[model samples]
Target chain A: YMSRYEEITQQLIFSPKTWLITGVAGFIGSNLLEKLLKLNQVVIGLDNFSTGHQYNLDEVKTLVSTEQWSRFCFIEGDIRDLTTCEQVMKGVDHVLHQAALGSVPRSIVDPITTNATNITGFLNILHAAKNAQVQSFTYAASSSTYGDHPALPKVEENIGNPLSPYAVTKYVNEIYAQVYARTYGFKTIGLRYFNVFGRRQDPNGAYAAVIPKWTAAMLKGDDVYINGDGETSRDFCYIDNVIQMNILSALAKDSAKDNIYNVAVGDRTTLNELSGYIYDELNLIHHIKYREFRSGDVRHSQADVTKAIDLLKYRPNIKIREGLRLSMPWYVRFLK
Target chain B: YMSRYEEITQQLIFSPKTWLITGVAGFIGSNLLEKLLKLNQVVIGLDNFSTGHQYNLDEVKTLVSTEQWSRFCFIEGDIRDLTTCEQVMKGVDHVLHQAALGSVPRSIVDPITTNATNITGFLNILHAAKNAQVQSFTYAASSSTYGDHPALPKVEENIGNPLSPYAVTKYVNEIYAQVYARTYGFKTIGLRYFNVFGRRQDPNGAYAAVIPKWTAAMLKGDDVYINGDGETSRDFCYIDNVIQMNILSALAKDSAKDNIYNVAVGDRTTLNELSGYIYDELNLIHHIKYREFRSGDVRHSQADVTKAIDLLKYRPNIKIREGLRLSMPWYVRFLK
Candidate 1:
């Protein structure tokens, strides 16, 4: 399930580069930090801990050696400020811009802040990166960008009208990235992550992802509610898979740059089936309930991942059950 | 060309509404202010005058009656602040969101501030209007939304990838508008204005619109530099026609709301022909010079107004020739 990804990892470890991961205290950012630090790469991290956590960074520290951790420099900053973005972006060879507000309902409730952080903040980082003249600029785009496209296995080219404010913000990121390439020759790669979930993923927010939210409720003996008759589906991705794509994207060939790639296993799972997987993964510890279909929620989603595979030598390394198996232990221990 | 439009205007005059015009001191915003005030509507105007002018406001005041002037309440503020947006949005019946950082080169030069004003500012005002529960929200979308498409005459539904940062922001406006409708039941109308030019359009800036910039140059007996081979074309719309659409859209039917419409004459004019027309209108005043094509400027732009005509009963009442003829004298008088 891999080629250039393994090659890139070898090359990265052989010759470590300065990498910047915005939102480094967040779930995916922390996971990425762990991977880069372990590879002996110098990583500069920027996070405001808005939705991110210091615990996640501390967790990454526990996972890596002291010398490896020392090689990491953490900057407590926000991407919303131009100076902050510029300061962290300086002399960075590769940029993994994973900073963003991630939930749909949160944006629905408060789109102004979401726009400020997601769209405006993204522009700040992007402009700063362009000025800094970084080698690679990669950011987290979303599968929700597929938005009302009625395609079963979503492809890169085919997309529909954005169905929510959060969806609108992410799509804006892709367009802006494309414009940067077209107008300024500043190439970037957009990873349309399809419901990424893994260790350190927040499980207690009002707008948490389904996997972590349900996984947490089960471990805590709380009721799990599915919003609909439980037929809603997604292309659930794991943290490691996303990390692979990010690294691949950071060192992407010039031809592979300025493009969007789906970052998932090209698999589909319904909410009803997802609950069952969680319940099974947790030794049948939780009960499931059905509710009205949530507003602004898409009926179904599944990524194609063909574009990623062909261009970036990406491999969908983990499927949903394996993804849950990998992260379930983390939840149990964190709760205990 | 006109049915519901006339009916809507008459009804508005009969029962005046409380209206909010963001960027009410700018070109299109001030023109809209003048028209709404002329219709006896109570208006609340917001502007920080970043690119807008106090002279434009004074001009509007001079044109309207004393009683009409009394109805306007101007708040020198910005749409970038949610508090300012929400505060002014209260009790507003109809909202005309004309506030945006408009220009391709300007945006390319500084995308961060443009994104803040155009994307973030647009969201703040939109969210405020939704929460304030305004009866209607109509925003200025752009023909730039039809980016990179091969089609000659743009339609509301069909669009292409944004060619510049400015185009991306305007397209984001439409998508956000669509999402607000789907997610929050906040129906709104988007008018994708194509090359809107007339009186009060600031002609002194580095990023001025073509007609005004050229007209101003002609009045000043300065060199009128045409970008490209002058074969590049546009569906030039006048300010009065745009005013007509705004009033109509504010009073659009429930069925007609939540739709994007092309606001332009169904006619194309080449820059070469346009320069001749302007020269003819001004009685032979300026020298024409050809230069390299402007970056991020679309080659040819026209609009198919069938959708606007059918749904909103829109009338593209001014051709480019007539539009130029009317505005030439205004430029001369203003220069004097």
Candidate 2:
């Protein structure tokens, strides 16, 4: 049973699998694309270039050899379009659905667009994949899904009411997927991502992830705004860990299908601690500034990633501090 | 303290407080409009006229007086547009948001469009009402929201995962309403309407509610499709009960705010029994047809109306049989 996962990983070095990565020009998508291409996989990538950029795709292309680049196909399509979703899923064996309007603030600003993409777009892709009979369907879920539940280390089933439209949209995806499994007999794995961050993530958008944007600002000797008390914490996941979880989920066999698993390092870090870590990493390099709390942000967030450990054999290789150090040089080089 | 509900009802009848009814030309919308106009209340109505008919509004005009007719201000617009929502909400004291794309089959056919209207359209109304600081915001929720849960009497908090895109969208409304109350201090009341039926419910639609459709069929001596062995059940609520709950919920004080109450009579009637009752009522005049079970139909459903009774003093005046008798005259008079 476990041999399939081992077989695929080893075989990926020589004769890689064909992978379909939606939102492939975005941070986690681009990272997954780069990793898959590095292992010589034939990749089919889709993005509407809404929040995703051509530059992110270009960055992935630059990271790989010319021979490996030829193994990848790119399609500019919106997942909200059923035909586009169908076209992308054709002949595809595995699907990693990362296409969605991210950021709680962006969703709050315009929830309709968020629902159109996050909820509708998600449904379209799931249906498309089920029609195509893909071996596995792995998509990005969220920790905001835990909503107003005050439990420490949020578990899989003990969720409260959603705090924002973004949270509601993400939670809806899980519900739809489960119903699809029960109603239509299609197995789907949802990765409930906990504040994932790494390089290639857009830093200029209003809804930019704090790690990337704050680090980019710090690298540029610019100001940073911390939302809430500096002591407010998160289970800040790194992109590599997230990518590993998706590949493992998509490639993993039957025992772990049709469920939501938290994808995190199972480590919590406060904003003050994160800021200190960033400053320490770049101090051999600049200076940083801090500000007041922002609204619509939860005070403390951490995921119990124990489910992933037991089921997916997920071992998070990057902690927040180490991930910050790994992510800083790229910001220094790119943002500079 | 409980006198507050009674005082408002009496005062509104005398002083004619302003009301905004979205989906104003829809089935429950038209019925509520007719009832409120009869109560001599000032109503500002809004509808996109999508699934809603101008004839429903015209029918209401015939039912009410010219003096009462003068109290209505009709706006032709989509609730999906925020500007329309904002424009309609101006100075509205209470909002009865009946605007939605109804039926499980319609939703399963096109989940995105369902999500767009049920979720997006609902949020647009909610955001506008929150901004307008309306006295009360009440929207149509559904029994389908109970989904696959095997409970005899569905309560407010103990909900199962939604089974269809339609169920997901309705549940999303309740979730958002709860979150808005927590996040912005916006008071909202969600009434989970269970199989509401009465006069003017469109009988000639792909997604027609069974009661009106059956009444029309029986009156015309046309065939009626019955999904399943008729053993599938529902807490079929009457339009008067629905309207009463809406009025009661709107007038409910702060203690009753920020919660969802099952807007149903505490009765469970299987489709087989319901069919017999409808036929028995109509056989006094005509015969009816029965067919195969419909997909996406719940196996069994009933509501615990205790919350509505305790909180909103909502007493269901018309049970299913009496409600069918009241609805019969409309079908006999109109369809004949």
Candidate 3:
């Protein structure tokens, strides 16, 4: 029997759908753009390019056929402005709201800007989408919401106090989404993405993700500083898995709506172990330094995605090891 | 023994401090303005006149002695701008953030503005206070945060999902406050206010509180339209009690900091009963109408203020009946 995700993708190819991918010039977004365009879906992509790169769009076009690329439209605008949000939301069937300022430390440093882009911006997009009355609304929630909770394998039901401004913004998105369902009967699905990393993920920025940052540092022959004894662990999800989750979430039935899902391969990887694996993939000399742990950083992390499995038939087939192996080549191509 | 609130008030009268009250021309803000100025404190008031009125400030000025009113500095600013927050935050000792765009329906109709004022504006105030290293930080939380939780009386620890954008914004304040306490070691207190009503509480505007709104309707000889069945109930705390809680929260010790307190008279009053009480106080004839229940409103609400009682030594001697009796004079003066 075909799994629901496979069936949905096949159905999407046969009977194409219109998709709105916010943050489309960013890593996760570009990958989604690639996949959806490959599926012959009409995709309207929006990005302010604040942290997003036009090169990622170039890369997406390079990967897809000319006809497939033509099926895509890009709106260079921000989610912070509601008028822009409403304008860009026209004729979009499914909304994959991936626009947000990510990075806990960055959020700590500039919470007001983060609040604008994440909380206020998220609300703008959400409110516009609701007014537009799109078929489905799916937003990118975060694993940082599993903040300060002492439980292993974080479940969707149980969340402790948010540890950072970024965490609060993401959690607020879920809360607003759920409330929209209750108040306006506008149901949505929130995918709480774990450490998502892969090709086209920006590695140059101060707020870059661990994999891209470490991979870039390795390629550039810089020292890899492991914060706080390298005991800090995480559920580093791959980009493909995130893509699958977003698609599944957008196509989810009403019975599975207005809920948050933990979208991670149900395995824990410590920073110490992940470093060794990244080194293994690179086949290059790398310096390592143990430093003080970052603040607003969780100690250990994992997820219990059984709810997504049971409800949305979610299957994260790519484990961290293979995903890392698949991801290194792009890092090499870009970094070198 | 005199309760801690009594001790604090006595201490404030003896040795006053500099205070910053956001939303200083609004109902609660102006009342806080009245008390603080009356105590002979140096007060900095910031308001954008969004919902706040200059008449409220004028009323407060009249109430306080000339010397007391001279100590008050009124700054025309909005907390949405960080520069304004930081500028007004200069030399501030105690920060009472009472600024928020209230009303579930108003937030529903215009969540973007609500999010801007409540969430963004609040974080601006909080971040400024933290950076300024204020002696104390206390903010106005809400009973609406007890959304959809099937509890008789809300305790500090237990909470359910927020029902509206306004509820979400208020709850976000508590979360941000706690996270600030955790991440920056900047401890603060949050007063989860119930249905606060009394003098200077605006009886005008579509988003006005029930007591003031209902009282106005009766006095104006307009039909009082109940949103839901009159069996709907609330913990109607008086402004005096709310004032007491804010003062206590501002002066609380480190041990008492980083906590959320349910600040209300530990009693429930139904809509039916409250209407009768308002009528009795004013001796005014009233027409009542029933309609569909408002969305994003809790069915029943009462606060289990055990934490506040134990820690803050809160003495809410003014029961709802006595509070109503005392409050009627102000309404009579204003409405007549």
Off by over 4 Å in 2: A1-7, A13-17, A222-229, A284-299, B1-7, B222-232, B285-294
Each model's DockQ? Answer: 0.84, 0.59, 0.84
Query: How do the residues A192-287 of candidate 2 rate in per-residue lDDT, one tens digit apiece?
Result: 999888888788867788888888788767787776668888899888888788888987778799989999888889988988888888776554
Instruction: Quote the lDDT for B38 in model 3.
Output: 78
Q: Which candidate would rank higher by lDDT, 2 or 3?
A: 3
Off by over 4 Å in 1: A229-231, A284-287, B1-4, B284-287
Docking class of 1: high
Flag regions of model 3 displaced more than 4 Å: A228-232, A284-289, B1-3, B226-229, B284-296
Worst 10-residue lDDT window for candidate 2 chain A reads A1-10
Question: How much DockQ does model 1 earn?
Answer: 0.84
lDDT of 3 at A253: 90
Docking class of 2: medium
lDDT of 2 by residue, B1-336 (tens): 334445666878987788999999999899889978988999999998989999999999988999999999999999988899999999999999999998888887777677778887898899888889888889889888888787788987787767777888888898889878776788888988998888887888777787887777767777767776677788898888888888888878898898888988889998778878888887776544455666677777789999888777777778999998888877787776
Error of 3 at A197 (Å): 1.9
Clashing pairs in 1: none
